[PDB]
Amino acid sequence: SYHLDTTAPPPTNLSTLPNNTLFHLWRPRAHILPAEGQIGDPCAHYTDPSTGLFHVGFLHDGDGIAGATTANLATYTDTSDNGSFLIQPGGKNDPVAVFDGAVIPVGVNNTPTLLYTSVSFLPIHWSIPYTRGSETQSLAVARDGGRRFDKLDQGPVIADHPFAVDVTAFRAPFVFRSARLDVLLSLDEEVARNETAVQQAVDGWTEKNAPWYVAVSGGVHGVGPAQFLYRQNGGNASEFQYWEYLGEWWQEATNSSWGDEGTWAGRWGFNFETGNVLFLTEEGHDPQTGEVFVTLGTEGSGLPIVPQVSSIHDMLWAAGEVGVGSEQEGAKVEFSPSMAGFLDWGFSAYAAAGKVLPASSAVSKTSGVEVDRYVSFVWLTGDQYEQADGFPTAQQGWTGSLLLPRELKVQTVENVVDNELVREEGVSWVVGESDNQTATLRTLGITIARETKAALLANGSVTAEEDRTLQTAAVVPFAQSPSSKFFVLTAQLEFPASARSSPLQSGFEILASELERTAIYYQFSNESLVVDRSQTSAAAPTNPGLDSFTESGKLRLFDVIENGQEQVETLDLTVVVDNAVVEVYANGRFALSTWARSWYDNSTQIRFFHNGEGEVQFRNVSVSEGLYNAWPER
Template sequence: MVAHSAAASTPLSVPSSSSSRSTIPSTIPNYNVAPPNLTTLPNNSLFDTWRPRAHILPPTGQIGDPCMHYTDPSTGLFHVGWLYNGAGIAGATTADLAMYQDLNPNGSQAIVPGGKNDPVGVFDGSVIPEGIDGLPTLLYTSVSYLPIHWSIPYTRGSETQSLAVTNASSAGRNFTKLPQGPVIPSPPFAANVTAFRDPYVFQSPHLDAILPSGPTNLSTAPWYTVISGGIHNAGPTQFLYRQHDPDFQYWEYLGQWWSEPTNSTWGNGTWAGRWGFNFETGNVFALDAEGYNPSGEIFGTLGTEGSDLPIIPQVTSIHDQLWVAGNVSMTDSDSVTFTPSMAGFLDWGFSSYAASGKVLPSSSQPSTDSGAPDRFISFVWLTGDLYQQAEAFPTDQQNWTGSLLLPRELTVLAIDNVVDNALSREAETSWRVSSTDAASGTVTLRTLGISIARETKSKLFSGSGSTSTERDRTLTSAGVTPFSRSPESKFFVLSARISFPSSARDSALQSGFQILSSDEEHTSIYYQFSNESIVVDRSKTSAASRTTEGIDSATEAGKLRLFDLQKDGEDVLESLDLTIVVDNSILEVYANGRFALSTWVRSWYANSTEIRFVHNGVGEATFENVTVSEGLYDAWPDRK
C-alpha cells in the first residue's frame, strides 16, 4: 500500500523466549493457555476480552463513522455521534471529554432510516447548533438506493441531503425529520459522481470575503457545506454549497471547489498517501496556534478511498485518513477554488478512518471547566474488522465491533530553531517553512498539531491505579530490558522522551518499547531511522492471530521526520516525545505533537502485561522521563 509504505524495512530482531502450551478444549476462555479458534466459542464469550475502558463505543454492536457532533447551546454539553449498526446515528453527551452518557437507553439511535427521503439508509450528518428556529439542525445524507461504491456506476437519486431538528425537550435524543423533500435533492447536473454524501456544515470568513455577495436575508453569516464524493474517470472532489435562506431550505451550489486527479498523490505520496478515487467525510475549519480561529489558516480532514494501482480501478478498500491545509481564491471564471499547501496523515493506522470533528467553543461545559479557548475537536473511527474484510473475525463471540479513538485537539503547530537544510526544505510534505532567520541559519516550520484533548489527557494520566517512573538510561546493546515495575493490567499510559545522537540519522538504529509482553506475546513500538518511521510490529502481538484468521497481525508504521535543531549554538537531533495509550486492545501512539498511529493489539494471555525497553544494538538511544500511569478511567460510569 503506497499510503503506508513506511512499514519496517527490516524487522527489529531482539531475543525473545517462547514456551509451548497445550490447548484445553473449553467453552469458557482460559487466558492462561493457548487460544482455540475463537469462532468456535459461544456467542458473547469474548465480550470483555478486548473491550476498552476509556474509549467511545456503544454498549453492544457495531460503531461506524463519527458524525452529528455539536455543543448544545442550552446546556453547554458536547454531543458526540456515530453511525450505529448500519441503521442510523446514535450518540452521547459529555461535560469533560472523558466521561459519557448515552442519549438513549441501550445506546439506541437518535435518527433512523425509513422516511420518504431515506427509505434505505441514514448516512453521516452535521449539526448547525442554532439552525431552524434556533434549534440544533441536522443536515444528513438520506439514502434511497444501494449499493453505492466508487468502483461501480452511480444510481442517480441514491444520496440526497435532508434536514432534521431536535428541540429542547428532546435534547438530542431524537432528531425529527422535516416533512418535506431533500434540501439538496441531487448531485450537480450532468456530474457522473462516484458518491455524494457526508455533508459537513461550517462558517468561513475567508469564503465570505472572496465570494460574490450572498443572500441578504440572513441575520448572521451564512453557513456552508462541503459534500464529499468524486467524478468517474476524473477524480475525487468536494462539492461546495452556501446557505441561501434563513430556514436552510435552499442551498446555492458553488462548484467543485477542490478536485484531484484520479488516485493521485500529494507530492510523491510519502507524507500523505493517495487522494484515491473518492473523498469521504470531508471537514473544513480554520486554526491558529491556540485552536479554532475562524480567520485562521484553512484546514480540512478527509477520508480517501483508493487503490494500490495509480490509474486502473481495483477494489482493494484502501482507506487513508488525511489532513490538508491550503488557501482559497477566485478563478477567472468566478468560481472558488481550494489549493492545498501541505498535507499529511491524521492517523497512520490501517484501521483509522472517517474522522469528523466540530468546533468546541470556550463557552461549552468542557472548555469552561478547563479554561480552554475555542477549539476544533476531531474524532476518528477505528474499525474493528478491517472495513468488514476480516470475515473470520469472531464478531458474534465479541458482540461489539470498532471504537472511536480519543478526542483530539487540532492546532497550528510551530517547530522552531530548525536547521535550514534540505530536510526542512523538502517540497510537498506535511510541513511548510513559515519564516527564515538567515543570521542563525534556521527556519520555523508550521504543520498540523495533533494531541489528545487536554481534559481527556489529564483524566488518562490521573488513572485509577498507580503511577511509576523508570530511571533514565542509555542503551547501546541489542536486546530487551524489562521495566523495574510493569503494569498489572492492560490499561495504562506510557510517556517518554528518547534522544539520539546526530550520527543516528544515517544509521539502521531501531529503539523503543515492547508492551503487553510475556514469553508468548509482545508488541514492539520503535523509531526506525532507515525510513524515518515509527513502527508498530504486531507480528507477535496476539496468540489468537495464530488460531483465528480474522485477528490481524500486520505491522503498521507511519512517517515522522526528526529535524536537525539548533540548541545552544550546536546542531542536535530532535528528540522523540512519545505518549502511548493502551486501553486493553486499543493502542494509540502520539509523537512530537504532530503524529498519531492507532491500531488493535489483541493480546491473549493474562500475564501479557510487561513493558520492556528495546534496542537493536546500532548506535545509542537515551530514555528519559519514562512514566507509566496505570488504570485509566471508566468512560461510561452509568452503563451496567
C-alpha cells in the same frame, strides 16, 4: 464445554465459541463506543447552545446515527437505551439507509438541526456505476434534548448531485462558517484578488450572522475525487431550504497524490470521504483568523480493482489558502493545498468527524479553557472495513471504537536548522520564518483533548524508569511493569546525529510475556514509527481474522539548535494502551492507532528495545496505570 480462561492457551478456532464469550477480552474502558454492537463513522457532533453540553454522534449497526453527551469531555452518557439512536432509516427520503451528517446549532425553529445523507439505493461505491438518486441531503430537528432528531416532513433540501455530473459519491455533508469565503464571494473579482483589500474586509466579519457552508464528499467518474461546496442561498443565514451550489472547490486527479512519490500524505485515491473544514490558529479554532485546514478520508485501490472494495482507507489532512476561481466560469472559490499529511497513520483509522468546541461550552467553562477549540474523533474500524478474514464477531458482541478525542491546531516547530530535511518537496509542513539561519515550521498539531488526557492520568499509579542509554542490541524489561493492559507510557528518546544514516530501530516492547509481545520503535531508514504486531496475539496464527500486519507512519526528526547547540530533534512519545486499543502519539504532531489483541492476562511486561544499530538515550520514561471509566452510567 469451554468457559474462557485467558491464563491458558486460546482455542484454535475462536469463531466456534459461544456468542459474547469474548465481550471483555479486548474492550477499552476510556474510549467512545456503544454499549454493544458495531460503531461506524462518528458524525453529527455539536455543542448544545442552551445547555453547553457537547453531543457526540456516530453511525451504529449500519442502522443510523446514535448519540451521547458530555459535560467535561472526559465522561459520557448515552442519549437513550436500545442503541441510543437519534435518527434511523425508513423515512420517505432515506428508505434504505442513513449516512453521515452534521449539525447547525441554531437552525430551524432556532434549534439544533441536522443535515445528513438520506439514502435510497445500495450499493454505493466509487468502483461501480452510480445509481441516480442514491444519496440526497436531508434535514431533521433535535427534539427532547438532542436525544432524538425528527426528520422534517418534506423531501431533501439538496435533492441531487451537481447537474449531469457523473459523481462517484455524494455524501457526508459538513457545515461550517468562514470569514474568508464570505469576503471572497462578497467582494469584486478584480478587488478580491489582492490579499490587501480582502484581509481588510475579513477584519470586519461577524460570525453570528454569517451564512453556512456545506462541503459534500465524493468524486467524479473518470476525472477524479473532489469535494462539492454549497451554502445558504444568496448567503442568507436564515435560508435552510435552498443551498446555492458553489462548485468543486477542491478536486484532484484520480489516484494522484501529494508530493512526487506520495510519501507524506498518501494518495488522493479514487474518492474523497467525510470531509471536515477547519480554521486553525496556533491556539485553536477561529473561522476569521484561522488558516484553512481539511481532514478527509481517501479511498485507494491497487490494480486490478476489486469491485466494491477499497484496499486503502487513508485518514489525511491538508492545509492551504482559498481564493477566487481565476477568471474562468467554474468553482466560485478554490482550496489550494500548501501542505498535507495523515491525521492518523493507522490502517484501521478513518472517517474523522470533528467539531468546534466553543470556550462558552460547559466543557470549556468547567475546565477553564479560554479559546475555541476544534475537537476531532477518528474512527477505528474493528473488522478492517468489513474485509476481515472471519473475525470472531459473534463471540465479541461488538465491533469498532472511536479513538481518543483530539485537539487540532497550528503547531510550530521552532529553532529548526534550515536544511534539506526542511526544504524537501511535498511535506507535511511549511516554513514560518527563516533567516536562512533557523526556520520555524508550521504544521498540524495533534494532541489528546486536554480534559481527556487529564482524566487518563487522573488516578493512575505512576512508576518511573531511570534514564538509560543503549548501544548494543538489547531488550531490557522495566524494573516494574503494569499488571494490566490499561496504561499510558511516556518517554523521550534522543539519537546522535550519526544515527540518521544507520539501520537503527529503538523503542519498546509492550503487552509482552513469554508467548506474546508488541513492538513500538522509531526507524531512521524510512524515518518511521513502527508497531510490529507479528507477535501480539498467541491466537492470531490460527485465527486470520486477527490482523497482525505491521503498522507505521512517517515522522521526521529535524536538526535543531536546543542549547546554542545542534542536535537531532527529541522523539517525544506518548502511548495509550486502552486494552485492545493502542494509540501512538509523537511530538504533538503524530498519531498512529491500531488493535493489539493480546490474549494472556500475563502479557503486561514492558521492555526497552534497541537493535544495536546506532545508539539511543531514553529519558523521562514513565508509566501511569489504570486510565478511567468513560461510561460511569453503564
